[PDB]
Amino acid sequence: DVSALAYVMLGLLLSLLNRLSLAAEAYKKAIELDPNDALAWLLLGSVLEKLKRLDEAAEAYKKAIELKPNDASAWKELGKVLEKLGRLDEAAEAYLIAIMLDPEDAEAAKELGKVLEKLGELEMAEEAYKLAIKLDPND
Amino acid sequence: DVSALAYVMLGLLLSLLNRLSLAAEAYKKAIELDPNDALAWLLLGSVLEKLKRLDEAAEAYKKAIELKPNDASAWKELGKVLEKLGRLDEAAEAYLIAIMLDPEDAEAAKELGKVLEKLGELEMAEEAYKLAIKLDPND
Amino acid sequence: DVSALAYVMLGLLLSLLNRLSLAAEAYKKAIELDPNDALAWLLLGSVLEKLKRLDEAAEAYKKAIELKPNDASAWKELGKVLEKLGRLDEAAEAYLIAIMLDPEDAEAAKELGKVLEKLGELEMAEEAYKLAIKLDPND
Amino acid sequence: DVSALAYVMLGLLLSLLNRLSLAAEAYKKAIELDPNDALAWLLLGSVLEKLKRLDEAAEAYKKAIELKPNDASAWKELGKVLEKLGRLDEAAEAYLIAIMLDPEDAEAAKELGKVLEKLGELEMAEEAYKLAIKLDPND
Amino acid sequence: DVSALAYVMLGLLLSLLNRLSLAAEAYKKAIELDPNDALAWLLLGSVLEKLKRLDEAAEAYKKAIELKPNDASAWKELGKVLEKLGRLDEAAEAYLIAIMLDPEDAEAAKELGKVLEKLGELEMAEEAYKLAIKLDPND
Amino acid sequence: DVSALAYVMLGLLLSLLNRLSLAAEAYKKAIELDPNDALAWLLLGSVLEKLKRLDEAAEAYKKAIELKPNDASAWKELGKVLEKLGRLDEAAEAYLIAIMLDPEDAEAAKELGKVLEKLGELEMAEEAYKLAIKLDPND
Amino acid sequence: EEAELAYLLGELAYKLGEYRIAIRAYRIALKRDPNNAEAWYNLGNAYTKQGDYDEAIEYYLRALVLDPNNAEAATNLGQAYMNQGDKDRAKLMLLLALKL
Amino acid sequence: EEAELAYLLGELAYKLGEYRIAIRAYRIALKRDPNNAEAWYNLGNAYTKQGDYDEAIEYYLRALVLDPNNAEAATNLGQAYMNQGDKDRAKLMLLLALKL
Amino acid sequence: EEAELAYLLGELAYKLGEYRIAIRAYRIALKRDPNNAEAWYNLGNAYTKQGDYDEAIEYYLRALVLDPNNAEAATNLGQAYMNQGDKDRAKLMLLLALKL
């Protein structure tokens, strides 16, 4: 039944109006109608982080990443949320996964350099930063 | 049937694009399809408030709150409407309920100070302003 | 169908016509159609009373009272029958129930005083007679 | 349905293993499936007898005797229980009934003599003992 | 269907014929037909006990006891198995439960005295032994 | 259903009560209702063995072992019957298989030693006897 | 039935002097078990200690109807009538108590 | 309904100073009737006498939200905040009590 | 479950010496929930304070059977046995209490 999808549109619309707090609860009903929707989980994860509600946002992102693998951008966003949460090692792991999925992603390399520098792997952080610069000199 | 939500979506679009006066009617049709919807009423309140038809926005917010208690956002919006209607006692009550729902909400404290000062409870208004500052100086 | 009630009217007519001995049988048929009728038993009690078959009039009144508690006049009539049966203790009890159900009717106090005089409770009989005289002037 | 007898068989087996205390319960379930079974009652009586619940066994024996009269063995087995309980008059009655049902049972005469001697009918006890001796000189 | 009990009968016969090792399997099939039967578990416990397979007999007795909580004799057999397993504390607990279910069981008191003596509770063991002797000197 | 099993009980009874020759027929009736019963054949084996009709007892044991492998008891019994029949090689094979199914059994070692002594494998018979003496203290 | 639980709460409240709540408890009990003579008598007693003699009379009467041998209820009703100044009714019920 | 009988038990326990029972009784009552203002207020009062001032706050807040005119609840909430050392919230709620 | 409310009434009654009320309330509770060890123990305590040591024994036994580690129940059971003059059982259960 199309109702399973309509709630996703409702959440997106509410997100466009900056009424995010209602958008999350709109996505929740869609999930409770169909827990297998990768798009619902991903959008909910990206909404929750804007409410400064981080840990649930990381949870939603991670649940999305199980439902469909290999999406190099979901890993990057989970890396951002983990980095904000201070779980720097797991954030480095996430950005490394992003690198593995797409070796040409310069943003992933920049974030990996940032997280490795924060984490104290100075040599590897510098290497990642240099790779990011070399991959996208226009960045 | 999904139409009950389709109308909400139509009104959301007509409020996103600047045609509020049609959005109100769309929300009204949605309500008549399903009076128990806690989101239709809540959005209709804001739409009517933006049209400056405050006398109806206050009632819309109140019905929404009746349909879904403990909503720390609906109480604040109803407080704004009540202040603009000049019924500062009810506005103070609304903001008090808001701060008592979310004791960490700095904005609720600031608004309570505002309405208390205009209502002549100078000491309580000062205390609320201090509470707002302590909870978040940026709010 | 109305047959369960018709026999009550037949007995009432026969009693009204001064044909009691057939009225008793009519009431008995009515009872056998429906033993729960609080109105059959009471009229049968009065009919048997006036035929001077007191021994069963007392039982008919008691059955009626059991089937329809908390009414004064049935207790009054049962008290009268008990009084004429010589069971003055039970008669005093019945008139006492009548007073307890309605403390304002002089007739019950008067007859209780009569029984108590015959029962030898001179002081209580005097109290009952005074109460009867105070409750109504003509009795 | 054969279960009503299967339970009797289970009780017999358990008695044969010397687990009497479970056999009693098996017999009881058998009885509750078919209260008119005389064999269940009789075997339950003789099981409760050896659990030394004498007075509980006497009732089972009596019910069995009620369910099939003239059972010359059941009467003697009830007489033994009654004799152990010391209700010697009823025991004498039971052994006398045993004599009446089968005048040639030497054991009945012997135990009737024993019970009469305990009961103080010395002459009758001696007569019963002599009868038992004459019936079965090989006893 | 009666088969569920016919298997119990088969196990009892095999145990009675001194072929226990097949009786255990017969009881197991009976249990798999109906796990709630108290007799099946209780008898399987003793069959396994006689085969010296104590490790399983203890659990069989426990499974039985969970289905007849206040059985005054299942506890005693479980106590014997536990004592032979060397879990003297749990054996003392079992015999204490046995005494508390039937304060007049002299055998339970004597066995509790034995277990306490082996366990080093010399004073309590002597108390239990004296109590058992007072309840019955031959037990 | 259950009739297929009842005959096994009938044979067990007629063997428990000493009427083997009817028990064999009862077992045969059971088999002709279900050839696959591993318990009917095994018992028929020992029943025929006790009647000293060994030529059939060995066959019944072998069919049972075919229907239900790995049970050392059946192998040992078949070895006993083969020992009686004088097929010492097959008896030694049976006892060897019994040891290999359960290397901790002293009885199998003792039987193998006896059979190998009779068969002329003096050294192996002595080894088996020593193993039997080492496996259990009373055999 | 839980009517007995409510009655027990009422009795405990009364014995400990919490008449104000004893009334409510006895009411919860009675409205589910109207034939309970003891409950009616105790409710009347609770109102008596409270000083609400009209209600006490009204409930004492209902108690006596259900239990005409209740000498204690008769004495209490007589005292209540005396508190209401109906010395005639009070004397009647006190004499009834002496008779019972 | 039990929502009243259990509340009565809670009130009786609290009046007699047996707070350990009062808390549990009020909870059993509230499980059926969450809109009961006085029940929340008394539960917070029991926790206050017990000295669990923050939990007393947590329940006084719901007492006030369901009954915004409850001046006594505001007073006790302010006192609980003061016990928690939040002089600012305490003073605000005390002033609220005086205003109401 | 109303068993909880009845038990709470029993506990409140017992803490205030209303042993009749305690017994009746605990009994109302237990017939709804027979596996409640502490209810049996408290009922035994009530009968003990009444001096009805036979009933106290009969209920302390069930308390121990459902909770074999209950040292307090063992102590009170031994005390009840001593009150019954059974020095042997009393000593046995007191030693059990010390062991537990």
Numbering used by the authors:
A (entry chain Y), B (entry chain g), C (entry chain 3), D (entry chain c), E (entry chain C), F (entry chain 7): 1 to 139
G (entry chain d), H (entry chain P), I (entry chain Z): 1 to 100
How is this structure described in the published paper?
Computationally designed multi-subunit assemblies have shown considerable promise for a variety of applications, including a new generation of potent vaccines. One of the major routes to such materials is rigid body sequence-independent docking of cyclic oligomers into architectures with point group or lattice symmetries. Here we describe RPXDock, a fast, flexible, and modular software package for sequence-independent rigid-body protein docking across a wide range of symmetric architectures that is easily customizable for further development. RPXDock uses an efficient hierarchical search and a residue-pair transform (RPX) scoring method to rapidly search through multidimensional docking space.
We set out to experimentally evaluate symmetric one- and two-component structures with polyhedral group symmetry generated using RPXDock. Given a set of prevalidated homomeric scaffolds with cyclic symmetry, we generated docks using RPXDock, and the resulting interfaces were sequence-optimized via Rosetta sequence design. E. Characterization of the two-component octahedral assembly O43-rpxdock-EK1 by cryogenic electron microscopy. To the right are representative 2D class averages showing different axes of symmetry and a reconstructed 3D map at 3.7 Å resolution. The overlay of the original dock (orange and purple) with the model built from the 3D reconstruction (gray) shows 4 Å Cα root mean square deviation between the original dock and cryoEM structure over 48 chains. Local resolution estimates range from ~3.2 Å at the core to >4.0 Å along the periphery of the extended arms due to a high degree of flexibility within this region. The protruding arms of the designed cage only start to become visible at very low contour levels.
